[PDB]
Scaffold this active site. Structure first.
Site, short mmCIF file in Angstrom:
data_model
loop_
_atom_site.label_atom_id
_atom_site.label_comp_id
_atom_site.label_asym_id
_atom_site.label_seq_id
_atom_site.Cartn_x
_atom_site.Cartn_y
_atom_site.Cartn_z
N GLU A 357 16.66 -24.56 -20.10
CA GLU A 357 15.27 -24.41 -19.66
C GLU A 357 15.18 -24.43 -18.14
O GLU A 357 14.31 -23.76 -17.56
CB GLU A 357 14.38 -25.49 -20.27
CG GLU A 357 14.32 -25.51 -21.80
CD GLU A 357 13.54 -24.36 -22.42
OE1 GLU A 357 12.82 -23.65 -21.69
OE2 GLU A 357 13.65 -24.17 -23.65
N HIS A 487 9.99 -15.21 -36.24
CA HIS A 487 9.82 -14.09 -35.32
C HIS A 487 9.24 -12.85 -35.99
O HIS A 487 8.35 -12.19 -35.44
CB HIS A 487 11.15 -13.76 -34.65
CG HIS A 487 11.75 -14.93 -33.93
ND1 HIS A 487 12.57 -15.85 -34.55
CD2 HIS A 487 11.63 -15.34 -32.65
CE1 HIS A 487 12.94 -16.77 -33.68
NE2 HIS A 487 12.38 -16.48 -32.52
#
Ligand SMILES: *[C@@H]1O[C@H](CO)[C@@H](O)[C@H](O)[C@H]1NC(C)=O
Ligand SMILES: *[C@@H]1O[C@H](CO)[C@@H](O)[C@H](O)[C@H]1NC(C)=O
Ligand SMILES: *[C@@H]1O[C@H](CO)[C@@H](O)[C@H](O)[C@H]1NC(C)=O
Ligand SMILES: *[C@@H]1O[C@H](CO)[C@@H](O)[C@H](O)[C@H]1NC(C)=O
Ligand SMILES: *[C@@H]1O[C@H](CO)[C@@H](O)[C@H](O)[C@H]1NC(C)=O
Ligand SMILES: *[C@@H]1O[C@H](CO)[C@@H](O)[C@H](O)[C@H]1NC(C)=O
Lengths: 596, 99
Positions: A357, A487
C-alpha cells in the site's frame, strides 16, 4: 481562437474544478470508510451524485471539440478520456435498469448469507464465516456443502440478472462504437497515434495466449505436484489421471492457492521464515512497521511520506464504538493528500501489505505533477505491479536480516528457498490460468461466441482444459457460477491481475539488473540502490501521459509484455518440480475420472 | 474549505509588472460572443481556492509579502536603524554624530 487552445482552456477549467470535486467526494468516501454512520453514507451518496453529474456535464461539453484537429498527444489523450459517453449514450430506461441491476448485485453479494439446512436460526457471512472454513478445513463434505450451497443461492439469484447484464452492457458498448463489452475493457491497453508504439485491442488476446502457452508447462508441473499432495491428504477422492476437485483449492473460488501451503509443503521438517514472533517480542507497533517501510523507500531513493500522511491516516483499529472497513486501501484523495486505511495487525502479511500500500502511495505521489485526468497508471497493470514489486522485495530474508527482524545466523539453504518459491508460486502462478480462463470466457460471452443456453457447458469445459479443475457435480443453466466472485459481479475488469503478474517480474528483473544483483532473482533485494529507484521513478513520474509500451521500454527495454522473467524467477523451483514429477504424471485429463 | 481566496485563471494577455486585475468579465476563449452568460467556450476568469488543513504541503496556503524598494529623486525617508555606540568622553575617538 484555434480549436487546440479552446480545448486547452477547457481542460484547465476541468482539471481545476474536477480536482476539488474529486477531493470532496474522496473525503466523503474516506469519512464513510473510517466512520460507518448513516449521515456519512448520505454525504458520500450526495458527493458521488455531484461527481457523476459533473463528469456527465463535462463530457457533454467535451464532445463538441473534434479530436482530429488536435495534434498534441497529452491534450488528445485527455480529450479521448473525457469524451467517452459511458452509460449516457444508452436510453434512460435501460441506463436506470442497468444501474438498478448493478446496485442489487452489489447488495446481494455484500449481504449474502448462507447456512446449513435444518439449522437456519443463524447464518454466516462469506467474508469471515466461510473464508476461514474454506482456508482451514480438512473435511471433504463440509467444504463441498459450503461451496455448493453458496453457488446454489448466489447463482440462482444472479442468473437472470447476469443475463440482463450481458445484453445491456453489450448494447452500451456497441452504442459506444465497440465490438462488445470485452472490447470496451480491452480498450484500456489501446495506444493510438504513437509511431511504432501503437497497441491494438485485438493484440491483447493474442499476447495473453502467447504468454499462457509458455505458462502451461510450469503450471502443469505445479498442478501435478499439488494433485499428488492432495491425493496424500485425501486418499480416494483425487484421481492420478484427472483434475482436482473444485472445493479443495483452499479458497472459495480458486482465485489463490496460498492456503494449500501447509498440505503441500516440500520440507515440513525445516523451519519457516516467520518473523511474527520477533516483532511480538520487541513490541513492534504498526507505526514502526510503516516507518520501516518508509526507510525501505528512502533507501531506494524514492521520496518519504508527507506529514499529512502520518497525521491523517488510520493505521490502527479505532475501537468498539467506531466502525471501520478492515480492508487495506491506499487513498489518493487529491491535492497532495495521501492516506492509508489499514487495520494493521502484528503479522508478516500485514507488513507486506503495508509495503504494498505504501508502494501504491508512492505511485500516486509520483504523478501528482501531471494533469488531473492523466493522474493514473499507464494501464491497470502498472498500478498494482509497483506495489507487488515492493511485496516481492520486502519478503526476502536479506531484507529481514538488514532491518534486524531476522537472526543474522539463520542458515539460508536450498530447501527453504524451494518451499518459499513454492508458496510464491501457489500465490502468484496459480491465479494465472484461472484469470486467463475467466477473462477469455467473459470475452466469448460478450462477443456472442457462446449462446446463453450453453454458458456453463463451455465454462466447465474451459476449466478442465485450462485450470485443470473438475466440477464436483454437474451444473445446469440455472446456476450462475462465475458471478459468485467479487470483481465479476460488481462490473470490474479481471485481466489486471494477469498483466500485474507479468509486469511484476519484468519490473523485478529490471530493478535487480539496475541494482547489479548477481544471484538468483528471488534472492534479490532492491534496497540501497539509488539507480534502481531512479529507473523506477522515471516511469513513475509519467503517469498516464505516456503509452504503457513506451513506459515498459523505459523500464525493461521491451515494447510488449513478457513471460520470461516469471520463468526465470521460478527456475530453481521449476527444476525441482521436474525432478519430483518423474514417477507421477504431469498434465491432466478433461474426462470425469475423479468424480462427477 | 476556505473559498475566500480567488485567483485569475484565464486572461487574454499576460499581466504587466505590478499590475492588479480585479475585472470580473467573462473570459472569451472562442470566436462566439459570451453574451454575459457562462456557457460553452466562455468561463469566469476568477476561480476560488479550496484551502483545507488536511492538504499536502504543496497545496497548503502560503502568505506571501513582497517588499519592493525603489529610489526616486525625492528625499529617502525609509531608512534602516543606525546603531548607536555608547558615548565615551575625555579620549581621542573618531566621532560620527548625525553624519
Ligand atoms: C464517528 O462518528 C460518530 C457519530 O457521529 C462521532 O461521534 C465521532 O466523532 C466520529 N469519529 C470520527 C473520528 O470522525
Ligand atoms: C501539450 O500541452 C501541454 C500543456 O497543455 C504542453 O506543456 C506541452 O508542451 C504540449 N506538447 C506539445 C508536443 O506541444
Ligand atoms: C456520445 O453520444 C453522442 C450521442 O449518442 C454521440 O453523438 C457521440 O458521438 C458519442 N461520443 C462518442 C465518443 O462515442
Ligand atoms: C522526509 O525527509 C526529509 C529530508 O530527508 C526530512 O527533513 C523530513 O522530515 C522527512 N519527512 C518526514 C515526515 O519525516
Ligand atoms: C540441496 O543441496 C544439497 C547439496 O548439494 C543436495 O544434496 C540436495 O538435494 C539439495 N536439495 C534440493 C531440494 O535441491
Ligand atoms: C542499506 O542502508 C541502510 C542505511 O545506511 C543500512 O542500515 C543497511 O544495512 C543497508 N543495507 C545493506 C544490505 O547493507
Amino acid at each position: 481562437s484555434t480549436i487546440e487552445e479552446q480545448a486547452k482552456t477547457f481542460l484547465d477549467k476541468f482539471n481545476h474544478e474536477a480536482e476539488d470535486l474529486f477531493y470532496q467526494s474522496s473525503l466523503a468516501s474516506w469519512n464513510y470508510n473510517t466512520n460507518i454512520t448513516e449521515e456519512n453514507v448520505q454525504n458520500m451518496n450526495n458527493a458521488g451524485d455531484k461527481w457523476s453529474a459533473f463528469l456527465k456535464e463535462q463530457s457533454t461539453l467535451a464532445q463538441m471539440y473534434p479530436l482530429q484537429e488536435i495534434q498534441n498527444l497529452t491534450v488528445k489523450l485527455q480529450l479521448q478520456a473525457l469524451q467517452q459517453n459511458g452509460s449516457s449514450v444508452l436510453s434512460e430506461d435501460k441506463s436506470k435498469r442497468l444501474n438498478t441491476i448493478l446496485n442489487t448485485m452489489s447488495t446481494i453479494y455484500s449481504t449474502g448469507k448462507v447456512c446449513n439446512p435444518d439449522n437456519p436460526q443463524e447464518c454466516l457471512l462469506l467474508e469471515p464465516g466461510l473464508n476461514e472454513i474454506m482456508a482451514n478445513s480438512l473435511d471433504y463434505n463440509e467444504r463441498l456443502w459450503a461451496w455448493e450451497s453458496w453457488r446454489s443461492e448466489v447463482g440462482k439469484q444472479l442468473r437472470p440478472l447476469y443475463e440482463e447484464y450481458v445484453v445491456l452492457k453489450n448494447e452500451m458498448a456497441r452504442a459506444n462504437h465497440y465490438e462488445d463489452y470485452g472490447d470496451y475493457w480491452r480498450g484500456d491497453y489501446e495506444v493510438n497515434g504513437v509511431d511504432g508504439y501503437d497497441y491494438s485491442r485485438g493484440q491483447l488476446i493474442e499476447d495473453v495466449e502467447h504468454t499462457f502457452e509458455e505458462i502451461k508447462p510450469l503450471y502443469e508441473h505445479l498442478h501435478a505436484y499439488v494433485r499428488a499432495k492432495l491425493m496424500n491428504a485425501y486418499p480416494s477422492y483425487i484421481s492420478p489421471i484427472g483434475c482436482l476437485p473444485a472445493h479443495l483449492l483452499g479458497d472459495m473460488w480458486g482465485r489463490f492457492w496460498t492456503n494449500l501451503y501447509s498440505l503441500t509443503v516440500p520440507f515440513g521438517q525445516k523451519p519457516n521464515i516467520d518473523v511474527t514472533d520477533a516483532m511480538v517480542d520487541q513490541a513492534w507497533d504498526a507505526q514502526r512497521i510503516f516507518k520501516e517501510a518508509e526507510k525501505f523507500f528512502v533507501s531506494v531513493g524514492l521520496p518519504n511520506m508527507t506529514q499529512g500522511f502520518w497525521e491523517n491516516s488510520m493505521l490502527t483499529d479505532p475501537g468498539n464504538v467506531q466502525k471501520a472497513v478492515c480492508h487495506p486501501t491506499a487513498w489518493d484523495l487529491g491535492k497532495g493528500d495521501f492516506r492509508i486505511l489499514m487495520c494493521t495487525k502484528v503479522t508478516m502479511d500485514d507488513f507486506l501489505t503495508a509495503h504494498h500500500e505504501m508502494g501504491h502511495i508512492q505511485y500516486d505521489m509520483a504523478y501528482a505533477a501531471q494533469p488531473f485526468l492523466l493522474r493514473n497508471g499507464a494501464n491497470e497493470g502498472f498500478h498494482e505491479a509497483v506495489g507487488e514489486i515492493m511485496s516481492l522485495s520486502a519478503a526476502t530474508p536479506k531484507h529481514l536480516k538488514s532491518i534486524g527482524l531476522l537472526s543474522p545466523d539463520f542458515q539460508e539453504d536450498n530447501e527453504t528457498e524451494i518451499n518459499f518459491l513454492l508458496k510464491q508460486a501457489l500465490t502468484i502462478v496459480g491465479t494465472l490460468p484461472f484469470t486467463y480462463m475467466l477473462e477469455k470466457w467473459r470475452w466469448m460471452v460478450f462477443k456472442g461466441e457462446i449462446p446463453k443456453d450453453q454458458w456453463m457447458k463451455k465454462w466447465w469445459e474451459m476449466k478442465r482444459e485450462i485450470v485443470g479443475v473438475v466440477e464436483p457435480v454437474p451444473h445446469d443453466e440455472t446456476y450462475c457460477d462465475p458471478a459468485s466472485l467479487f470483481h465479476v459481479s460488481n462490473d470490474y475488469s479481471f485481466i489486471r491481475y494477469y498483466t500485474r503478474t507479468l509486469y511484476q517480474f519484468q519490473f523485478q528483473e529490471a530493478l535487480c539488473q539496475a541494482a547489479k544483483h548477481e544471484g538468483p532473482l528471488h534472492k534479490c533485494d532492491i534496497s540501497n540502490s539509488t539507480e534502481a529507484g531512479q529507473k523506477l521513478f522515471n516511469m513513475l513520474r509519467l503517469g498516464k501521459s505516456e503509452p504503457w509500451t513506451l513506459a515498459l521500454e523505459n523500464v525493461v527495454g521491451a515494447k510488449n509484455m513478457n513471460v520470461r522473467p516469471l520463468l526465470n524467477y521460478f527456475e530453481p523451483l521449476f527444476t525441482w518440480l521436474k525432478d519430483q514429477n518423474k514417477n507421477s504424471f504431469v498434465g491432466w485429463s478433461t474426462d470425469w475420472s475423479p468424480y462427477a | 474549505g476556505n473559498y475566500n481566496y480567488l485567483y485569475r485563471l484565464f486572461r487574454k494577455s499576460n499581466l504587466k509588472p505590478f499590475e492588479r486585475d480585479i475585472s470580473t468579465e467573462i473570459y472569451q476563449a472562442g470566436s462566439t460572443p459570451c453574451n454575459g452568460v457562462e456557457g460553452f467556450n466562455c468561463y469566469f476568469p476568477l476561480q476560488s481556492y479550496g484551502f483545507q488543513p488536511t492538504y499536502g504541503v504543496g497545496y497548503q496556503p502560503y502568505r506571501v509579502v513582497v517588499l519592493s524598494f525603489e529610489l526616486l529623486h525625492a528625499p529617502a525617508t525609509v531608512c534602516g536603524p543606525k546603531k548607536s555606540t555608547n558615548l565615551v568622553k575625555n579620549k581621542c575617538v573618531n566621532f560620527n554624530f548625525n553624519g
